[PDB]
Amino acid sequence: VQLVESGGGLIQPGGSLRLSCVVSGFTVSSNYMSWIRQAPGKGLEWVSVIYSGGSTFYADSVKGRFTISRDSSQNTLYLQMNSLRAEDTAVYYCARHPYGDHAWGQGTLVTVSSASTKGPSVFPLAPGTAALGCLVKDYFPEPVTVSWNSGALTSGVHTFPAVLQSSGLYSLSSVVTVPSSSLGTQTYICNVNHKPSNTKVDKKVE
Amino acid sequence: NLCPFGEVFNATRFASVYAWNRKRISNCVADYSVLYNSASFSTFKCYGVSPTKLNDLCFTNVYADSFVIRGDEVRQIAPGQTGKIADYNYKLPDDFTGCVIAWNSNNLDSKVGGNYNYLYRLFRKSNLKPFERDISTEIYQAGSTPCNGVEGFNCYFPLQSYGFQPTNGVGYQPYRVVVLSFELLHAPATVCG
Amino acid sequence: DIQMTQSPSPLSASVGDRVTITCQASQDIRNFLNWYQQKPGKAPKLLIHDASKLEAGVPSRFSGSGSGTDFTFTISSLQPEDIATYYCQQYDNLPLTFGGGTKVEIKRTVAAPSVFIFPPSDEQLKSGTASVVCLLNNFYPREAKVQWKVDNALQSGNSQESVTEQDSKDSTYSLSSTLTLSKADYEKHKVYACEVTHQGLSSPVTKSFNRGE
């Protein structure tokens, strides 16, 4: 069974998004399904449920604004989110939740902010054991994904959690510990990707 | 002759909500105010009429439906409600002329070791129509593969058991419910006061 | 609403010991309690359903007890990969409600941090800003002090930190401290130092660079 959420991203307060959840492995119109969201750093909150026979129920924080729905043709669950508020910023999960066999999707991040998308600027963190890395600074909508040597380097890598700066822009660093004997004999490139700005940046560290 | 309201209210056994009982009351006289003054009913809320006024009205047929549900599901035995009981077990019409009576039955219907004999429909593809009675025990089909009578993945037994214990919270304690339905048919009115 | 109250906030144990998380319900919820495990960065995973019934593929060390309002969740022998945030959730009464969460952490022998300092890049200095970064690598326990010093002037208010999640294998943490300065102030001083204090270190360790050398 697979559940795949989509439709999430940045949106200004007061706007509307429609999330989608495509199901493989059961009939969305015959099953109990719920929307559960998780704000960044906080816990889980139940938002909406649709019953096997169509009756719908909502959390109090989302009434009059959120609507849950289904299409039997495409085997897809929908969440129409109107009049969005910053408190609705969360990763949203679909699930065959309350009754019936358990299933959870991987989530879709919704950010509700008046701030603007900004792509990261990537600067090197230049080097027995040695350490090097990349500083990924001044990006907003989040997430940023960092890989090293296009996936070749995975051992010794620590991509730190992002911090929120006073500007309202995020910043993170990714570091990697390598044998120092290899600093002249090996190329280290950090691959930074920020799909909300469609930015990909590769950066060599020397 | 007085109406057999004792056989429906003081009955030693009640039905499960999915297979609710119906008593068709005919050719008798009924004091609805004697019912109301039992001081043991936790819910006795009539829609579209009054108990006193019922004593003056005449009807062709009166129906007494009865079943057992959880305490927190009595709010669903009302017009315009949704939920597992209202949607898949006992549905009242939005245009309901009748009474809804319920009382706590924890001393009668709960047992040590759990009383697991009272059931309710958990899965159904479509809401019941008003006054429908789905006794189907066929396996519920949650996916594309046929079930072939075997409970398994994507194949569910449609009924679940209430677990009535003595010390459940009142919302999880059994309540006996009687719904009185009043009926003008284009026929002789034979139930009066 | 039914409000779920969990074992406060962080809970730690050594590898192989027991961990007991308690969940309290505002009112009777029978056995209709779910327990989820959420590892860092991933989706919640249902471990126990119906208070005690262990989902398929779930290791034997996980177990669930309780009925009515008080429930417990137990790991009989904690493994380094069981680092996660565990949630209880009542599912049979509406406003479906979760516990606040209980983070579970490995206790581990002391491990001193490896310290590295990174001077600003010339690509950043074009913009007019200078970021000095300090790294503390693979240390336990989490508590560590980073003190930025610019010409032995203790610096406050111009730095942010970030700690990784405990590693699933060595049960360590890593920390990143970033000192952000304007290019004007950055050129007003020579020695930029990162002084680190940690239980695994007998004395504080300082790593320094002199600007433009």
Author numbering:
A (entry chain A): 2 to 128, 136 to 214
B (entry chain E): 334 to 526
C (entry chain B): 1 to 213
From the paper:
The omicron variants of SARS-CoV-2 have substantial ability to escape infection- and vaccine-elicited antibody immunity. Biochemical and structural analysis indicated the majority of these mAbs bound to the receptor-binding domain, mimicked the receptor ACE2 and were able to accommodate or inadvertently improve recognition of omicron substitutions.
Of the seven antibodies in group 1, five bound to the receptor-binding motif surface mimicking that of ACE2 and belonged to the class 1/RBS-A/RBD-2 community antibodies.
